[model samples]
Target: HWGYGKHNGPEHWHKDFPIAKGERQSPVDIDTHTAKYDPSLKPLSVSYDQATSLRILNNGHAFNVEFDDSQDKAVLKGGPLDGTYRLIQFHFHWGSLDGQGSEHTVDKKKYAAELHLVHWNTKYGDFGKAVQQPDGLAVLGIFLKVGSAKPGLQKVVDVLDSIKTKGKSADFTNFDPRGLLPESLDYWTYPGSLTTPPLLECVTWIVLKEPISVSSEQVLKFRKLNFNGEGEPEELMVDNWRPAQPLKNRQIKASFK
Candidate 1:
C-alpha cells in the first residue's frame, strides 16, 4: 500500500509487499534485544588491493562497483574462508533525506540505507554465470546513516564530482574499501536474495550490526544522481532503496562477543 503507490518504483517488490496483502518484510522494529548474542561467524580473507580492482558502473538504480573476474583478486586465501569467490558488484541504497534507506527489516527497525557487496562462488567460472546457481553467492550488508562526519567515505564521495552527471562513472583510483568497514566485525548471517531485479536468491547474507555514519551533506550529494531514462530528462535520485523482505522462516545468526 505504501511503496507501490506509483509506477517504476520497485514493482518487483510486489511479490513480497503486495498491493492489498499483508506480507512479512524487513525494517521490522528491533525490540532492543541486547541479549549477549554469540559472535561466532568466521571471517573470509580478502585482500584490499584486490578488492580495489572493482570496476565502477552506474546502472540507474544506484552507483555500482563491479569486480572484474579477469583480475587476480578473483581468488582469496587464508582465514576460515578459502577458494575463489569472484566479486561481482556492489551498490548503495539511500534516501532523499537522512531518515530511512535500508533493504532488510530487523524486527521492523529501519536504518538510513544499506550497502551491498556482492560476490559469487567461483564454481561457475564467472560472476554472471555464478549468479544463476542457488549456492553461488555471498553479500555483505553495511548500514549507513547521518551522524558525525566520517572521513573514511570521502574517498568515494570525492569521485562523485566526475560521475555527478548521472548514469556516468569513471575509474575511482587507489582507494581501499576495507577501511570503510566498522570496527566491529560482528555480523548477522542469513540466507537471502538480491534486493535488485532478476532477484536471485543465492546469497549468504552477512549484515553488520554496527552502522557507519555520513554527514547530511553527503546524503544529499548521493541523492543528486538519476536513472537517465528516455522518458524523463531528470528523475530525482533520492530514496534509492528497496522495501524490506520477509525472513520466511530463515534463521538469523550473529557473530559477536
Candidate 2:
C-alpha cells in the first residue's frame, strides 16, 4: 500500500499516478511577497449549521472526520470559489516531528500540521463526478502551529484512540468543525491537484494565512495511530503529508495584501 515510507512515499507516487507531474501540482510554497493581491477576491464563508458528523476513520493515509453528505447540509462559499461548494469531509496531515508537517509551505516555511476541509461544487453532480472537473473541488486549508493546546481540535484528538488502526472507524457526531478554522478567512488561492496519489488536478485550493494553535504534546498523541492493520507490524501513523511540489508557473492570488 502507498504510504510515507521510503518505498512508497511521494517520490514514488508519480510512477503510478503520472498526473503528479501535471502543471497544477499542489502544496506549492506560498511565497507571500510574490503572491499577487486580487481586489476581486471575496471573503470566504463556511457554514456548519445543520451539519452532522457521521464518523471518524483511520484511512491509513490520514484520519478523517466525515459529515452526513447525503442527509444534511454544510456549505462553503464566496472567496475564490464560484457558486456554492458542499463540505463533505475534513482531515489532517502532519509529521513525525513538530518541526515538520504542513503540506503547503509559506515563504519556504512549514507549519506543525495542516487541516483540509474538503468541499465539492454542486453543479457537477455528486462528489465523484465533480472530482473530474477543473473547478469541481475546493479544499479549505488551515495550518496548525505547535503552541498552546487548542480545544477546538480536542474533539478530534479524543477520538483518535477509537480509530487507532487502519480501516477503523467510530461514530463521531454533534461536533462542529467550523471552530477548527482560523479567525481570519484571508487565504492564498491557486489551481492545484490533490497532495495524495491519483493526484487529480481538479481542486481550487484556498489555504489560510493564519495558523491555529496546538501544543506539541497534543500533536504527539497522533502517533498512537497504527498505519498497519491488527496482527501486522506496528507502524505508527505519522508524517502523513506530501512534500511541496514545483510551482509550474501557477499564479498565487491572495485575498489580502
Candidate 3:
C-alpha cells in the first residue's frame, strides 16, 4: 500500500505516480517573504449553512467527515475561484508528534496538524469528472496549532474512537464544517495537486495565514485511529502527511499585504 512508511513513503510515490514529478505538486513550503500579495484578490465570501454529516470513516491514511454533496448543501465562492465550488468533505493530516503534522509549511515551520476543506467545481459535472479537469478543485488548508481546546473542534475529536480502524465507518451527525474556521481568512494561494496519491493536478490551494487552536490532548485522540484494517498489521496512523514538494515554476499568491 502507498503510505507513510520507509518503503512506501513520499519518495516512493513518484515510482507509481509519474505525475509526482509534474510541474505542480502540493504541500510546498509557503515562503511568506516572497509570496506576492495580489490586490485583485477578493475578500473570501464563504457563505455556508448547517452541514448535514452523512458519515465518518477511517480511510487507512486519515479520517474524514463525509458530507452530502448531492445538490450543493454547502458551497464556497470568491478567493481565487471563478464559479462556486461545492464543499464535499473535510479531512486532516497529522504528525507522529506535535509541531510536525501540517503538510504545507510556513517558512519551513510545520503545525501540529492541517485541516483541508475540499471543494469541487460544479461546472465540471460531478466530483469524478471535476477531479480530472485542470480547474476542478479548490482546497482550503487551515494549519492547526497545539493551544487551547477549540470548541468547534472538540465535537469531531469526541467521535474518533468509534471508527478506530481502516474501513470502519460510523454514523456522524450534527456537525458543521464551517464553524471551525479561524478568525481571519487571509491566505496564500497556489496551483497544486492532491496531497495524496492519484495525485491529480487539479487543486487551487488556499493555505490560511492564521491558524486555529487545538489542545495537545485532542490531537492524541486522532493518533488513536489505526492505519491498518481489521486482522491486518496493527499500525498507528501517524505522520500521514506528504512532505513539502518543490515549488517549481508556480508562484504562491498572497491575499494580504
Candidate 4:
C-alpha cells in the first residue's frame, strides 16, 4: 500500500499511481503575491449539523471523522464553488516536529499540520460517482499552528488513545466541526486533486488564510498513533504529508485582498 515512508513516500507515488504527476495535483504552494484577488467571490456558506457526525476511523493514513451525508444536513456552498457539496469526512496530516508537515504552503512557509474537510458535490449523487467528475470534490484546508491548546480539538484528541493502531475505530457524535475553524473566512481557491492515492484531479481546493491553534501536548498525542495494525511492527504515524505539487497553468483565486 502507498504510505509515507522511506521507500513508498510521496516522491515514489508516481510509480503506483500515475495521476500523482498530473497537472492539477493538490497541496500546491500558495504564492500570495501572485494569487489574484477576486472581489466577487461570495462568502462561503457552510452548514454542518453536529448530529450528522457519525464515527471516527483510523485508516492507517490518518484519523478521519466520517459524516452522514444521506441528507443535506451538512453542506458547503459559495466561495468559488458552483453547487452544494455534502460533507463526507475530515482528516489531518501532521509531522513529528513543529513548523512542518502541512501539505500546502503559503509563501513557502509550512505549518505544523493541516486539516482536510472532504465534501462531495450533491449534483453527482454520491461520493463514489463524484470522484470521476471535474467539479466532484471540494476540500477545505485549514493550517494548524502550535500555540495555545484548542479546546475544540480536545474532543478529537480524547479519542486518539483508543484508535492508536491502524484499522481501529470508535463511535463519535454530536461534535460540531465549525469549532475547529478560524474566525476569518478568507481563503485561497484553485483546481487540484486528492493529496492521497488514486490522486484524482477532481477537487476544488479551498485553503484558509488564517490558522487555528493547537498546543504542543495535543500535537504529541497524534504522534503516538501507529501506521501498523495490532500485531505488526509499530511505525509512528507522523510526517504523513505529501509535498507541494506544481501549480502548472492554474491560477489561485483569493477571497480577500
For all candidates, the clash counts are: 17, 0, 0, 0
- Where does the lowest 10-residue lDDT sum fall in candidate 1? 20-29
State residue 91's C-alpha deviation in candidate 3, in Å: 0.4
Tens-digit lDDT track of model 2 for 1-257: 67899999998888898898889999899998999999998877888787888899998889889887774389889998898898889998998888889999999899889999998998886899998899999999999999889888888888898888989999998988877977888899999988898899989999999999998777988877889887789999999999889998789999987
lDDT winner among the candidates?
4
Which regions in candidate 4 have their CA more than 4 angstroms from the true location? Answer: none
TM-scores of the candidates are 0.81, 0.97, 0.98, 0.98
CA error at residue 35 for candidate 3, angstroms:
0.4
Question: lDDT (0-100) at residue 249 of candidate 4?
Answer: 89
State each model's CA lDDT, in order: 0.63, 0.89, 0.90, 0.93
Residue-by-residue lDDT tens digits, candidate 1, 1-257: 12312665675555653421223233222323532354444565555555654456556677876656566563432222335566666678887666677876455666777777777777677777877776577777888878876787777776665665445777864556676677776666666666665466666666777888878877777777666643457776667676765445556666655
Model 4, span 173-200: residue lDDT tens: 8878988999998899999999999999
Model 2 stretches astray by more than 4 angstroms? none
Looking at model 2, report the run of 10 residues with the lowest lDDT sum.
64-73
Candidates 3 and 4 compared: the better one by TM-score is 4
The Cα error of candidate 3 at residue 115, in Å, is: 0.4
